[PDB]
Amino acid sequence: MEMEKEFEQIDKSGSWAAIYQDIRHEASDFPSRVAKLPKNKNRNRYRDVSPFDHSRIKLHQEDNDYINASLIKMEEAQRSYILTQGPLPNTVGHFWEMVWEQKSRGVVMLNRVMEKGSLKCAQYWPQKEEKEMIFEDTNLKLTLISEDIKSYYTVRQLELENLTTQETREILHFHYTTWPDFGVPESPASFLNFLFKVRESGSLSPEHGPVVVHCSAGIGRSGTFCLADTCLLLMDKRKDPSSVDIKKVLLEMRKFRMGLIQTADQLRFSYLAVIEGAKFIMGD
Ligand SMILES: CSc1ncccc1C(N)=O
């Protein structure tokens, strides 16, 4: 059913809460036993948000391989994403280890460091060219190369060095800086502009490791970003664009990480973003 009509039918009937609870009821439940080991308590931001054992990203070290991060692998769309929490004071070194080991080109950040007067994630990248960061626990160096500040987002060029081998790589940091403290944006225009900038960079392409995407918990805004991207890509591959079912794509993604899309308002915004985004996809 053309999602634009499904959209007006749910709006006129005011049933967003009912659709959202149906998704919550049908979502997969897989074990997260590694996340809950006592040795990992200070590696989790939130007690109720954990990666499943089957899809978790493993760090390449014998000591403790755990990070709160999941591989979302979308078989038909041919896209992969790593969704992760905002880094904590004791996991900033683990975060950059994962970027290095997974061969990621891009990091997508959908939150501010401070929101609602509380810290939502560590200051995990350098703010000045001449003040680089060293992560002694994982043997990495990170340098700010350049910064481009726009009205809705900032793009940064970073240099990551493996101090063990002296190899270097360029990482692009895409920072969406205008998501409101409460609710969702009124129009999806600036979020879609941002998505198109990440795509144009090469960061989502199969010649690189998966993009790393985060917010505070790595399920709500992070969920909206990957759901919109996958739905738009499927509309371009299929003979019948109207066959793309956003609720079925979301349940497929929830096989790989719990809780993706945190509110009925986030579900409505995801529909809005895909409907507006299609106009350009359909060469219009
Ligand atoms: C208007 S149709 C179209 N336009 C661009 C890319 C893909 C399609 C399609 N058939 O899905």
PDB file of C-alpha atoms and ligand atoms in Angstrom:
ATOM      1  CA  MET A   1       0.000   0.000   0.000  1.00  0.00           C
ATOM      2  CA  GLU A   2       1.622   3.316  -1.215  1.00  0.00           C
ATOM      3  CA  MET A   3       3.096   4.555   2.126  1.00  0.00           C
ATOM      4  CA  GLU A   4       1.877   8.209   1.454  1.00  0.00           C
ATOM      5  CA  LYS A   5      -1.755   6.899   1.681  1.00  0.00           C
ATOM      6  CA  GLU A   6      -0.983   4.589   4.654  1.00  0.00           C
ATOM      7  CA  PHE A   7       0.498   7.868   6.137  1.00  0.00           C
ATOM      8  CA  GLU A   8      -2.641  10.063   5.719  1.00  0.00           C
ATOM      9  CA  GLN A   9      -4.855   7.106   6.959  1.00  0.00           C
ATOM     10  CA  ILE A  10      -2.783   6.817  10.256  1.00  0.00           C
ATOM     11  CA  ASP A  11      -2.703  10.679  10.685  1.00  0.00           C
ATOM     12  CA  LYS A  12      -6.491  11.117  10.059  1.00  0.00           C
ATOM     13  CA  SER A  13      -7.173   8.126  12.427  1.00  0.00           C
ATOM     14  CA  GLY A  14      -4.508   9.302  15.006  1.00  0.00           C
ATOM     15  CA  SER A  15      -3.162   5.689  15.420  1.00  0.00           C
ATOM     16  CA  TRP A  16       0.680   6.279  15.532  1.00  0.00           C
ATOM     17  CA  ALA A  17       0.910   4.878  19.134  1.00  0.00           C
ATOM     18  CA  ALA A  18      -0.988   1.695  18.080  1.00  0.00           C
ATOM     19  CA  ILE A  19       1.215   1.019  14.946  1.00  0.00           C
ATOM     20  CA  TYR A  20       4.393   1.621  17.096  1.00  0.00           C
ATOM     21  CA  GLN A  21       3.276  -0.826  19.869  1.00  0.00           C
ATOM     22  CA  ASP A  22       2.548  -3.537  17.174  1.00  0.00           C
ATOM     23  CA  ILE A  23       6.221  -3.188  16.007  1.00  0.00           C
ATOM     24  CA  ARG A  24       7.414  -3.404  19.661  1.00  0.00           C
ATOM     25  CA  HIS A  25       5.343  -6.642  20.135  1.00  0.00           C
ATOM     26  CA  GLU A  26       6.609  -8.387  16.892  1.00  0.00           C
ATOM     27  CA  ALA A  27      10.330  -7.366  17.334  1.00  0.00           C
ATOM     28  CA  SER A  28      12.999 -10.121  17.689  1.00  0.00           C
ATOM     29  CA  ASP A  29      14.405 -11.120  21.142  1.00  0.00           C
ATOM     30  CA  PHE A  30      17.934 -12.623  21.010  1.00  0.00           C
ATOM     31  CA  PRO A  31      20.411 -13.131  23.895  1.00  0.00           C
ATOM     32  CA  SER A  32      22.902 -10.361  24.976  1.00  0.00           C
ATOM     33  CA  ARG A  33      24.919 -12.434  27.528  1.00  0.00           C
ATOM     34  CA  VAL A  34      28.366 -10.824  26.809  1.00  0.00           C
ATOM     35  CA  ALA A  35      26.881  -7.238  27.376  1.00  0.00           C
ATOM     36  CA  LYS A  36      25.592  -8.334  30.843  1.00  0.00           C
ATOM     37  CA  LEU A  37      28.905  -9.846  32.235  1.00  0.00           C
ATOM     38  CA  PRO A  38      30.009  -7.906  35.368  1.00  0.00           C
ATOM     39  CA  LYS A  39      33.439  -7.046  33.794  1.00  0.00           C
ATOM     40  CA  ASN A  40      31.475  -4.956  31.141  1.00  0.00           C
ATOM     41  CA  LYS A  41      29.274  -2.753  33.396  1.00  0.00           C
ATOM     42  CA  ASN A  42      31.365   0.441  32.773  1.00  0.00           C
ATOM     43  CA  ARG A  43      31.297  -0.261  28.927  1.00  0.00           C
ATOM     44  CA  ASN A  44      27.453   0.278  28.734  1.00  0.00           C
ATOM     45  CA  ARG A  45      25.837   3.739  28.885  1.00  0.00           C
ATOM     46  CA  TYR A  46      22.289   2.366  29.532  1.00  0.00           C
ATOM     47  CA  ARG A  47      21.353  -0.892  31.414  1.00  0.00           C
ATOM     48  CA  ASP A  48      18.382  -1.544  28.995  1.00  0.00           C
ATOM     49  CA  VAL A  49      20.313  -1.060  25.630  1.00  0.00           C
ATOM     50  CA  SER A  50      22.666  -3.949  24.698  1.00  0.00           C
ATOM     51  CA  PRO A  51      23.944  -5.515  21.485  1.00  0.00           C
ATOM     52  CA  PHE A  52      22.753  -9.089  20.682  1.00  0.00           C
ATOM     53  CA  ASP A  53      25.515 -11.728  20.902  1.00  0.00           C
ATOM     54  CA  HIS A  54      24.980 -12.902  17.275  1.00  0.00           C
ATOM     55  CA  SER A  55      25.509  -9.418  15.643  1.00  0.00           C
ATOM     56  CA  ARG A  56      27.904  -7.657  18.163  1.00  0.00           C
ATOM     57  CA  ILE A  57      31.182  -6.091  16.891  1.00  0.00           C
ATOM     58  CA  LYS A  58      34.237  -7.826  18.442  1.00  0.00           C
ATOM     59  CA  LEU A  59      37.434  -5.847  19.271  1.00  0.00           C
ATOM     60  CA  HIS A  60      40.642  -7.665  18.018  1.00  0.00           C
ATOM     61  CA  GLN A  61      42.222  -8.290  21.443  1.00  0.00           C
ATOM     62  CA  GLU A  62      42.451 -11.319  23.774  1.00  0.00           C
ATOM     63  CA  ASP A  63      41.942  -9.329  27.062  1.00  0.00           C
ATOM     64  CA  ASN A  64      38.292  -8.137  26.547  1.00  0.00           C
ATOM     65  CA  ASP A  65      36.699  -7.997  23.031  1.00  0.00           C
ATOM     66  CA  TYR A  66      33.477  -6.186  24.175  1.00  0.00           C
ATOM     67  CA  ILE A  67      31.992  -2.873  22.782  1.00  0.00           C
ATOM     68  CA  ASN A  68      28.320  -1.755  22.768  1.00  0.00           C
ATOM     69  CA  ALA A  69      28.029  -1.889  18.934  1.00  0.00           C
ATOM     70  CA  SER A  70      26.033  -4.017  16.376  1.00  0.00           C
ATOM     71  CA  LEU A  71      26.485  -4.918  12.632  1.00  0.00           C
ATOM     72  CA  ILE A  72      23.191  -4.209  10.720  1.00  0.00           C
ATOM     73  CA  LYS A  73      23.573  -6.201   7.367  1.00  0.00           C
ATOM     74  CA  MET A  74      20.774  -5.367   4.792  1.00  0.00           C
ATOM     75  CA  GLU A  75      20.979  -8.230   2.216  1.00  0.00           C
ATOM     76  CA  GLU A  76      18.548  -6.962  -0.529  1.00  0.00           C
ATOM     77  CA  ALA A  77      19.707  -3.294  -0.293  1.00  0.00           C
ATOM     78  CA  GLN A  78      23.451  -4.378  -0.231  1.00  0.00           C
ATOM     79  CA  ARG A  79      24.246  -1.906   2.639  1.00  0.00           C
ATOM     80  CA  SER A  80      25.867  -2.506   6.072  1.00  0.00           C
ATOM     81  CA  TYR A  81      25.945  -0.110   9.107  1.00  0.00           C
ATOM     82  CA  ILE A  82      27.566  -0.322  12.559  1.00  0.00           C
ATOM     83  CA  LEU A  83      25.199   1.253  15.161  1.00  0.00           C
ATOM     84  CA  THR A  84      26.865   2.131  18.523  1.00  0.00           C
ATOM     85  CA  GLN A  85      26.245   4.198  21.711  1.00  0.00           C
ATOM     86  CA  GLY A  86      27.942   7.597  22.201  1.00  0.00           C
ATOM     87  CA  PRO A  87      31.411   6.763  23.607  1.00  0.00           C
ATOM     88  CA  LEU A  88      31.994   6.886  27.414  1.00  0.00           C
ATOM     89  CA  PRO A  89      35.110   8.262  29.181  1.00  0.00           C
ATOM     90  CA  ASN A  90      36.526   4.709  29.447  1.00  0.00           C
ATOM     91  CA  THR A  91      35.499   3.506  25.875  1.00  0.00           C
ATOM     92  CA  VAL A  92      36.872   6.351  23.620  1.00  0.00           C
ATOM     93  CA  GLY A  93      40.002   4.191  22.879  1.00  0.00           C
ATOM     94  CA  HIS A  94      37.746   1.124  22.103  1.00  0.00           C
ATOM     95  CA  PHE A  95      35.616   3.305  19.736  1.00  0.00           C
ATOM     96  CA  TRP A  96      38.640   4.348  17.555  1.00  0.00           C
ATOM     97  CA  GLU A  97      40.030   0.721  17.707  1.00  0.00           C
ATOM     98  CA  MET A  98      36.683  -0.452  16.153  1.00  0.00           C
ATOM     99  CA  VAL A  99      36.809   2.258  13.410  1.00  0.00           C
ATOM    100  CA  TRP A 100      40.428   1.128  12.580  1.00  0.00           C
ATOM    101  CA  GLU A 101      39.735  -2.659  12.692  1.00  0.00           C
ATOM    102  CA  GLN A 102      36.454  -2.486  10.651  1.00  0.00           C
ATOM    103  CA  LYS A 103      38.050  -0.194   7.900  1.00  0.00           C
ATOM    104  CA  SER A 104      35.311   2.447   8.230  1.00  0.00           C
ATOM    105  CA  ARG A 105      35.670   5.671   6.121  1.00  0.00           C
ATOM    106  CA  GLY A 106      32.937   7.676   7.952  1.00  0.00           C
ATOM    107  CA  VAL A 107      31.489   8.352  11.448  1.00  0.00           C
ATOM    108  CA  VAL A 108      27.917   9.799  11.616  1.00  0.00           C
ATOM    109  CA  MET A 109      27.076  11.668  14.922  1.00  0.00           C
ATOM    110  CA  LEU A 110      23.376  12.678  15.429  1.00  0.00           C
ATOM    111  CA  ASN A 111      23.641  14.238  18.961  1.00  0.00           C
ATOM    112  CA  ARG A 112      25.384  17.182  20.743  1.00  0.00           C
ATOM    113  CA  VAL A 113      27.930  16.367  23.524  1.00  0.00           C
ATOM    114  CA  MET A 114      25.582  18.240  25.949  1.00  0.00           C
ATOM    115  CA  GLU A 115      21.730  18.105  25.582  1.00  0.00           C
ATOM    116  CA  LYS A 116      19.040  18.898  28.225  1.00  0.00           C
ATOM    117  CA  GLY A 117      21.936  20.094  30.530  1.00  0.00           C
ATOM    118  CA  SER A 118      23.570  16.593  30.799  1.00  0.00           C
ATOM    119  CA  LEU A 119      26.468  14.882  28.990  1.00  0.00           C
ATOM    120  CA  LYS A 120      25.176  12.571  26.153  1.00  0.00           C
ATOM    121  CA  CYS A 121      28.712  11.420  25.044  1.00  0.00           C
ATOM    122  CA  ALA A 122      32.451  12.017  25.656  1.00  0.00           C
ATOM    123  CA  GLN A 123      34.369  14.736  23.709  1.00  0.00           C
ATOM    124  CA  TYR A 124      36.006  11.923  21.628  1.00  0.00           C
ATOM    125  CA  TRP A 125      37.643  13.985  18.754  1.00  0.00           C
ATOM    126  CA  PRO A 126      40.123  16.974  18.858  1.00  0.00           C
ATOM    127  CA  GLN A 127      38.741  20.541  18.587  1.00  0.00           C
ATOM    128  CA  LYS A 128      42.054  22.197  17.468  1.00  0.00           C
ATOM    129  CA  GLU A 129      44.565  21.186  14.765  1.00  0.00           C
ATOM    130  CA  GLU A 130      47.607  21.711  17.069  1.00  0.00           C
ATOM    131  CA  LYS A 131      46.161  19.642  20.016  1.00  0.00           C
ATOM    132  CA  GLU A 132      45.969  16.005  18.834  1.00  0.00           C
ATOM    133  CA  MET A 133      44.616  13.102  21.027  1.00  0.00           C
ATOM    134  CA  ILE A 134      46.534   9.930  21.984  1.00  0.00           C
ATOM    135  CA  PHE A 135      44.590   6.799  23.205  1.00  0.00           C
ATOM    136  CA  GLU A 136      47.305   4.914  25.183  1.00  0.00           C
ATOM    137  CA  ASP A 137      45.080   1.841  25.931  1.00  0.00           C
ATOM    138  CA  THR A 138      44.644   1.086  22.102  1.00  0.00           C
ATOM    139  CA  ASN A 139      47.871   2.761  20.700  1.00  0.00           C
ATOM    140  CA  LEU A 140      46.093   5.275  18.341  1.00  0.00           C
ATOM    141  CA  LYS A 141      46.636   8.985  17.513  1.00  0.00           C
ATOM    142  CA  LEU A 142      43.842  11.221  16.190  1.00  0.00           C
ATOM    143  CA  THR A 143      44.463  14.714  14.575  1.00  0.00           C
ATOM    144  CA  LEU A 144      41.933  17.322  13.367  1.00  0.00           C
ATOM    145  CA  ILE A 145      42.875  18.146   9.691  1.00  0.00           C
ATOM    146  CA  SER A 146      40.008  20.554   8.731  1.00  0.00           C
ATOM    147  CA  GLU A 147      36.473  21.559   9.807  1.00  0.00           C
ATOM    148  CA  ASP A 148      33.532  22.894   7.633  1.00  0.00           C
ATOM    149  CA  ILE A 149      30.697  24.393   9.835  1.00  0.00           C
ATOM    150  CA  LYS A 150      27.256  24.820   8.100  1.00  0.00           C
ATOM    151  CA  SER A 151      23.853  25.905   9.523  1.00  0.00           C
ATOM    152  CA  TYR A 152      22.521  22.314  10.115  1.00  0.00           C
ATOM    153  CA  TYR A 153      25.710  20.112  10.210  1.00  0.00           C
ATOM    154  CA  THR A 154      29.564  20.182  10.467  1.00  0.00           C
ATOM    155  CA  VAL A 155      31.938  17.969   8.413  1.00  0.00           C
ATOM    156  CA  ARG A 156      35.443  17.259   9.764  1.00  0.00           C
ATOM    157  CA  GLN A 157      38.497  15.591   8.182  1.00  0.00           C
ATOM    158  CA  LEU A 158      40.435  13.510  10.811  1.00  0.00           C
ATOM    159  CA  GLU A 159      43.727  11.565  10.540  1.00  0.00           C
ATOM    160  CA  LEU A 160      43.844   8.249  12.477  1.00  0.00           C
ATOM    161  CA  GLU A 161      47.307   6.697  12.993  1.00  0.00           C
ATOM    162  CA  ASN A 162      47.954   3.149  14.221  1.00  0.00           C
ATOM    163  CA  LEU A 163      51.057   3.917  16.393  1.00  0.00           C
ATOM    164  CA  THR A 164      52.021   0.143  16.295  1.00  0.00           C
ATOM    165  CA  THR A 165      52.573   0.121  12.434  1.00  0.00           C
ATOM    166  CA  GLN A 166      52.693   3.916  11.656  1.00  0.00           C
ATOM    167  CA  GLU A 167      49.914   3.445   9.016  1.00  0.00           C
ATOM    168  CA  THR A 168      47.467   6.415   8.668  1.00  0.00           C
ATOM    169  CA  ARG A 169      43.934   6.799   7.216  1.00  0.00           C
ATOM    170  CA  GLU A 170      41.613   9.717   6.545  1.00  0.00           C
ATOM    171  CA  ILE A 171      38.248   9.458   8.489  1.00  0.00           C
ATOM    172  CA  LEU A 172      35.320  11.825   7.673  1.00  0.00           C
ATOM    173  CA  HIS A 173      33.182  12.973  10.696  1.00  0.00           C
ATOM    174  CA  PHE A 174      29.567  13.943   9.736  1.00  0.00           C
ATOM    175  CA  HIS A 175      27.961  15.817  12.688  1.00  0.00           C
ATOM    176  CA  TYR A 176      24.216  16.655  12.518  1.00  0.00           C
ATOM    177  CA  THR A 177      24.075  19.502  15.124  1.00  0.00           C
ATOM    178  CA  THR A 178      20.386  20.704  15.007  1.00  0.00           C
ATOM    179  CA  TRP A 179      18.186  17.729  16.151  1.00  0.00           C
ATOM    180  CA  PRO A 180      15.961  19.389  18.856  1.00  0.00           C
ATOM    181  CA  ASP A 181      16.405  18.516  22.600  1.00  0.00           C
ATOM    182  CA  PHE A 182      12.670  17.330  22.636  1.00  0.00           C
ATOM    183  CA  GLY A 183      10.660  15.627  19.828  1.00  0.00           C
ATOM    184  CA  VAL A 184      11.690  15.401  16.098  1.00  0.00           C
ATOM    185  CA  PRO A 185      12.394  18.060  13.416  1.00  0.00           C
ATOM    186  CA  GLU A 186       9.232  19.734  11.967  1.00  0.00           C
ATOM    187  CA  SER A 187      10.503  19.206   8.345  1.00  0.00           C
ATOM    188  CA  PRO A 188      12.799  16.349   7.146  1.00  0.00           C
ATOM    189  CA  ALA A 189      14.491  18.645   4.557  1.00  0.00           C
ATOM    190  CA  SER A 190      17.742  19.290   6.523  1.00  0.00           C
ATOM    191  CA  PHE A 191      18.049  15.593   7.686  1.00  0.00           C
ATOM    192  CA  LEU A 192      17.707  14.368   3.993  1.00  0.00           C
ATOM    193  CA  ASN A 193      20.244  17.036   2.828  1.00  0.00           C
ATOM    194  CA  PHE A 194      22.631  15.603   5.510  1.00  0.00           C
ATOM    195  CA  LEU A 195      21.989  11.950   4.422  1.00  0.00           C
ATOM    196  CA  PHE A 196      22.814  12.949   0.773  1.00  0.00           C
ATOM    197  CA  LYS A 197      26.122  14.587   1.952  1.00  0.00           C
ATOM    198  CA  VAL A 198      27.162  11.335   3.740  1.00  0.00           C
ATOM    199  CA  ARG A 199      26.305   9.327   0.558  1.00  0.00           C
ATOM    200  CA  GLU A 200      28.247  11.735  -1.752  1.00  0.00           C
ATOM    201  CA  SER A 201      31.397  11.236   0.446  1.00  0.00           C
ATOM    202  CA  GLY A 202      31.775   7.464  -0.375  1.00  0.00           C
ATOM    203  CA  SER A 203      31.325   6.633   3.366  1.00  0.00           C
ATOM    204  CA  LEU A 204      28.302   4.263   2.665  1.00  0.00           C
ATOM    205  CA  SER A 205      29.891   2.522  -0.356  1.00  0.00           C
ATOM    206  CA  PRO A 206      31.070  -1.139  -0.566  1.00  0.00           C
ATOM    207  CA  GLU A 207      34.731  -0.257  -1.217  1.00  0.00           C
ATOM    208  CA  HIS A 208      34.953   0.770   2.538  1.00  0.00           C
ATOM    209  CA  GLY A 209      34.112  -0.947   5.878  1.00  0.00           C
ATOM    210  CA  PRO A 210      30.613  -0.144   7.248  1.00  0.00           C
ATOM    211  CA  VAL A 211      29.846   3.466   8.325  1.00  0.00           C
ATOM    212  CA  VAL A 212      29.809   3.928  12.172  1.00  0.00           C
ATOM    213  CA  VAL A 213      26.526   5.624  13.288  1.00  0.00           C
ATOM    214  CA  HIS A 214      25.766   6.884  16.854  1.00  0.00           C
ATOM    215  CA  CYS A 215      23.540   9.103  18.992  1.00  0.00           C
ATOM    216  CA  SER A 216      23.405   8.775  22.813  1.00  0.00           C
ATOM    217  CA  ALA A 217      22.000   5.147  23.026  1.00  0.00           C
ATOM    218  CA  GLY A 218      22.557   4.308  19.300  1.00  0.00           C
ATOM    219  CA  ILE A 219      18.903   3.164  18.615  1.00  0.00           C
ATOM    220  CA  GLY A 220      16.611   6.228  18.146  1.00  0.00           C
ATOM    221  CA  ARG A 221      18.063   8.959  15.816  1.00  0.00           C
ATOM    222  CA  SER A 222      20.617   6.281  14.666  1.00  0.00           C
ATOM    223  CA  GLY A 223      17.655   3.991  13.753  1.00  0.00           C
ATOM    224  CA  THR A 224      15.981   6.813  11.750  1.00  0.00           C
ATOM    225  CA  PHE A 225      19.174   7.447   9.685  1.00  0.00           C
ATOM    226  CA  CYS A 226      19.702   3.763   8.586  1.00  0.00           C
ATOM    227  CA  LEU A 227      15.918   3.095   8.033  1.00  0.00           C
ATOM    228  CA  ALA A 228      15.553   6.163   5.743  1.00  0.00           C
ATOM    229  CA  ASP A 229      18.751   5.296   3.747  1.00  0.00           C
ATOM    230  CA  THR A 230      17.794   1.567   3.214  1.00  0.00           C
ATOM    231  CA  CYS A 231      14.116   2.383   2.230  1.00  0.00           C
ATOM    232  CA  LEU A 232      15.242   5.012  -0.403  1.00  0.00           C
ATOM    233  CA  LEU A 233      17.881   2.572  -1.829  1.00  0.00           C
ATOM    234  CA  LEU A 234      15.211  -0.225  -2.167  1.00  0.00           C
ATOM    235  CA  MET A 235      12.825   2.236  -3.992  1.00  0.00           C
ATOM    236  CA  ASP A 236      15.643   2.659  -6.638  1.00  0.00           C
ATOM    237  CA  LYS A 237      16.348  -1.121  -7.146  1.00  0.00           C
ATOM    238  CA  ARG A 238      12.727  -2.486  -7.347  1.00  0.00           C
ATOM    239  CA  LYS A 239      10.439  -2.486 -10.468  1.00  0.00           C
ATOM    240  CA  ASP A 240       7.503  -1.474  -8.166  1.00  0.00           C
ATOM    241  CA  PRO A 241       8.641   1.423  -5.903  1.00  0.00           C
ATOM    242  CA  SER A 242       5.277   1.176  -3.980  1.00  0.00           C
ATOM    243  CA  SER A 243       6.150  -2.377  -2.720  1.00  0.00           C
ATOM    244  CA  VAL A 244       8.646  -0.954  -0.122  1.00  0.00           C
ATOM    245  CA  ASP A 245       7.084  -1.601   3.342  1.00  0.00           C
ATOM    246  CA  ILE A 246       8.821   0.630   5.970  1.00  0.00           C
ATOM    247  CA  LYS A 247       7.408  -1.441   8.928  1.00  0.00           C
ATOM    248  CA  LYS A 248       8.843  -4.676   7.404  1.00  0.00           C
ATOM    249  CA  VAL A 249      12.284  -3.036   6.789  1.00  0.00           C
ATOM    250  CA  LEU A 250      12.329  -1.817  10.452  1.00  0.00           C
ATOM    251  CA  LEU A 251      11.526  -5.359  11.787  1.00  0.00           C
ATOM    252  CA  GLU A 252      14.366  -6.796   9.589  1.00  0.00           C
ATOM    253  CA  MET A 253      16.798  -4.187  11.086  1.00  0.00           C
ATOM    254  CA  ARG A 254      15.540  -5.074  14.638  1.00  0.00           C
ATOM    255  CA  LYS A 255      16.855  -8.637  14.075  1.00  0.00           C
ATOM    256  CA  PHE A 256      20.380  -7.030  14.410  1.00  0.00           C
ATOM    257  CA  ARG A 257      19.926  -4.397  17.226  1.00  0.00           C
ATOM    258  CA  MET A 258      17.110  -3.967  19.804  1.00  0.00           C
ATOM    259  CA  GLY A 259      14.899  -0.873  20.144  1.00  0.00           C
ATOM    260  CA  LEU A 260      15.564   0.887  16.776  1.00  0.00           C
ATOM    261  CA  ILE A 261      13.079   3.883  16.589  1.00  0.00           C
ATOM    262  CA  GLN A 262      12.368   4.825  20.262  1.00  0.00           C
ATOM    263  CA  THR A 263       8.982   6.705  19.897  1.00  0.00           C
ATOM    264  CA  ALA A 264       5.811   6.929  17.724  1.00  0.00           C
ATOM    265  CA  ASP A 265       7.015  10.472  16.732  1.00  0.00           C
ATOM    266  CA  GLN A 266      10.366   8.992  15.430  1.00  0.00           C
ATOM    267  CA  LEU A 267       8.291   6.384  13.430  1.00  0.00           C
ATOM    268  CA  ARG A 268       6.141   9.191  11.850  1.00  0.00           C
ATOM    269  CA  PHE A 269       9.291  11.270  11.057  1.00  0.00           C
ATOM    270  CA  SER A 270      10.913   8.204   9.308  1.00  0.00           C
ATOM    271  CA  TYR A 271       7.787   7.893   7.056  1.00  0.00           C
ATOM    272  CA  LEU A 272       7.906  11.678   6.313  1.00  0.00           C
ATOM    273  CA  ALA A 273      11.647  11.528   5.403  1.00  0.00           C
ATOM    274  CA  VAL A 274      11.181   8.537   2.992  1.00  0.00           C
ATOM    275  CA  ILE A 275       8.062  10.119   1.308  1.00  0.00           C
ATOM    276  CA  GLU A 276       9.792  13.533   0.706  1.00  0.00           C
ATOM    277  CA  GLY A 277      13.110  11.804  -0.250  1.00  0.00           C
ATOM    278  CA  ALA A 278      11.419   9.737  -3.043  1.00  0.00           C
ATOM    279  CA  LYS A 279      10.586  12.947  -5.079  1.00  0.00           C
ATOM    280  CA  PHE A 280      14.355  13.406  -5.888  1.00  0.00           C
ATOM    281  CA  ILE A 281      14.970   9.575  -6.245  1.00  0.00           C
ATOM    282  CA  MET A 282      12.080   9.615  -8.850  1.00  0.00           C
ATOM    283  CA  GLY A 283      14.204  12.174 -10.821  1.00  0.00           C
ATOM    284  CA  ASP A 284      11.610  14.892  -9.905  1.00  0.00           C
TER     285      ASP A 284
HETATM  286  C1  LIG B   1      10.438   7.318 -11.855  1.00  0.00           C
HETATM  287  S1  LIG B   1      11.079   5.601 -11.817  1.00  0.00           S
HETATM  288  C2  LIG B   1      12.784   5.506 -11.174  1.00  0.00           C
HETATM  289  N1  LIG B   1      13.547   6.643 -11.266  1.00  0.00           N
HETATM  290  C3  LIG B   1      14.839   6.624 -10.798  1.00  0.00           C
HETATM  291  C4  LIG B   1      15.420   5.476 -10.221  1.00  0.00           C
HETATM  292  C5  LIG B   1      14.623   4.302 -10.142  1.00  0.00           C
HETATM  293  C6  LIG B   1      13.295   4.263 -10.603  1.00  0.00           C
HETATM  294  C7  LIG B   1      12.557   2.978 -10.468  1.00  0.00           C
HETATM  295  N2  LIG B   1      11.922   2.302 -11.486  1.00  0.00           N
HETATM  296  O1  LIG B   1      12.445   2.404  -9.347  1.00  0.00           O
END
